[PDB]
Write a protein that binds this DNA or RNA. Sequence first.
RNA 1: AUUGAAAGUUUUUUUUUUUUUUUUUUUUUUUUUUUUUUUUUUUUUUUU
Length: 136
Amino acid sequence: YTFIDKRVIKRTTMIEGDVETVSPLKIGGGKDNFDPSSLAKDSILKDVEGRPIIPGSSWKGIFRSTGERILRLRNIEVCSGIGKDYCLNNNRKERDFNSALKENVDQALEIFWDYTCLNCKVFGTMSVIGAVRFLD
RNA sequence: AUUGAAAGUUUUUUUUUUUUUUUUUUUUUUUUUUUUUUUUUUUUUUUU
């Protein structure tokens, strides 16, 4: 039950890798302004020094969608982790979880372990922080 | 119409002076404005 409990960090895993673009890459820069010395009107997201960084949000979204596809392939039920559609809401256990938050923590942990999916318990869901952090 | 009477118990004198309801006493001790959201989809550098 250490997976959900964030009080104690009993392990720490870190992956540092290099991403090489086999195909051309275009991360949308907002298509609303071209502040730096870009090339086309639809500028990609870049640092003030011109460095075209990749947002951590994009990594998180890509990983979440790929995991959704993988779990759907493995016939494993999974939340959508977006909008008003997470299996906390789908299972109608949100009110009980909110009550348990003020109440004994063990009940909240049991609820979040039994009535919860994997993607929105790993990447995180509403009012719960995910276990994994994505950097830029 | 008394043995038979006609006299203010009155004048005069400030219950006044000395003395700060005063000294000491911090409306503070605790609480991360975080939390789930891919700037995405559509478009053949192209003809008489």
